Write a protein that binds this ligand. Structure first.
Ligand SMILES: O=C(Nc1ccccn1)[C@H]1CCN(C(=O)COc2ccccc2F)C1
Ligand SMILES: [Cl-]
Length: 350
């Protein structure tokens, strides 16, 4: 059983290609629509196909963003094409992507269920690779707006991490306002809970901070069914925000009196042998004030990741670490001087 389409390649020029695939399973649907898995007939390589309804007014914002992206830590759009199903009179956009077997979510929870934490080496690798992907897209003025473990793909063998689901992703432009109903429940930044629409890309950094902590703690750090329940868990950890800070998050000061709690000494939040540089990093991402949070690029160059810049560092299975230092000038444009930290001596050797 074999389907053959004519699909436009993700990057490169408009050179339509005949693509045949088979073994079409399904792997979840959800809001957008269905996601299939298939095997490309010639190469035998696995792909994921995200099939979503195509709006007849505007062209699809996810697609437009995916074509402008090329980065080692972002899922590759191989092809995209259009189809339907039965009479319908409605058109579907099909995004063909490189299949990646695992996700941080699934892995994180395998370790959680078997009451263990992920080895810190894997935490470093995954987090670094995320911040690179954020650094890259932020450099185009694009915010993901839905950083969460379920959207961090993994190849367990290679330790390669790839950011996916660009369905909420959008070119943020200072002056222009954006919907405050975007990010998933536990990974929402305070300014989003307070319903701000003047938010920047720093929401992604908050979100990432929540992922780090969760990998350290082995469970979400800021849980809760309601905005209120979450804000409590945040206040418990960060302490009660000063009148200034609330003014910085959402200036519209939504109008609630929070209970007055002191900051829980950040070190007293995690397991006893938790690397202190990991803890430091957390607190520089999970800041109330959006501007006071590290940039992705600054985080990549944090001391917590020093072990990745060691020339001897290998994966515990023995294979080399994946690409970590092949920065582009684009990717560094945030702050080029950091190249002196990010690209270690041993990577400059000829
Ligand atoms: O989704 C996957 N890979 C993937 C996705 C998109 C692009 C490239 N690779 C794999 C990784 C682990 N997987 C899954 O979690 C199983 O599939 C899903 C189940 C429920 C909702 C959504 C789902 F995608 C299947
Ligand atoms: Cl042609």
């Amino acid at each position: 059983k074999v389907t053959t389409v004519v699909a436009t390649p993700g990057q490169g020029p408009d050179r339509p290609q005949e693509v045949s695939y088979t073994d079409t399973k399904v792997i979840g649907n959800g809001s957008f629509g269905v996601v299939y898995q298939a095997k490309l007939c010639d190469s035998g390589e696995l792909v994921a196909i995200k099939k979503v309804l195509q709006d007849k007014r505007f062209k699809n914002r996810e697609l437009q963003i995916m074509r402008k992206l090329d980065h080692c830590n972002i899922v590759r759009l191989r092809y995209f094409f259009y189809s339907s199903g039965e009479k319908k009179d409605e058109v579907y956009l099909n995004l063909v992507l490189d299949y990646v077997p695992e996700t941080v979510y699934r892995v994180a929870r395998h370790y959680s269920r078997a009451k263990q934490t992920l080895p810190v080496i894997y935490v470093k690798l995954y987090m670094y690779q995320l911040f690179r992907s954020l650094a890259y897209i932020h450099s185009f003025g694009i915010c993901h707006r839905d950083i969460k473990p379920q959207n961090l793909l993994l190849d367990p063998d290679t330790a390669v991490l790839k950011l996916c689901d660009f369905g909420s992703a959008k070119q943020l432009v200072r002056g222009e306002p954006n919907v405050s109903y975007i990010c998933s429940r536990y990974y929402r930044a305070p300014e989003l809970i307070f319903g701000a629409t003047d938010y920047t890309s720093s929401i992604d950094v908050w979100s990432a901070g929540c992922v780090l902590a969760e990998l350290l703690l082995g469970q979400p750090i800021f849980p809760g069914d309601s905005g209120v329940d979450q804000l409590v868990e945040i206040i418990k950890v960060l302490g009660t925000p000063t009148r200034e800070q609330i003014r910085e998050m959402n200036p519209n000061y939504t109008e609630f009196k929070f209970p007055q709690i002191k900051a829980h000494p950040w070190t007293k939040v995690f397991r006893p042998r938790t690397p202190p540089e990991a803890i430091a990093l957390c607190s520089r991402l999970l800041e109330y004030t959006p501007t006071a949070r590290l940039t992705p690029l600054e985080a990549c160059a944090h001391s917590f990741f020093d072990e990745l810049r060691d020339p001897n560092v290998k994966l515990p299975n023995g294979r080399d670490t994946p690409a970590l230092f092949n920065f582009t000038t684009q990717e560094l444009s945030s702050n080029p001087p950091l190249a002196t930290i990010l690209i270690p001596p041993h990577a400059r050797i000829q």
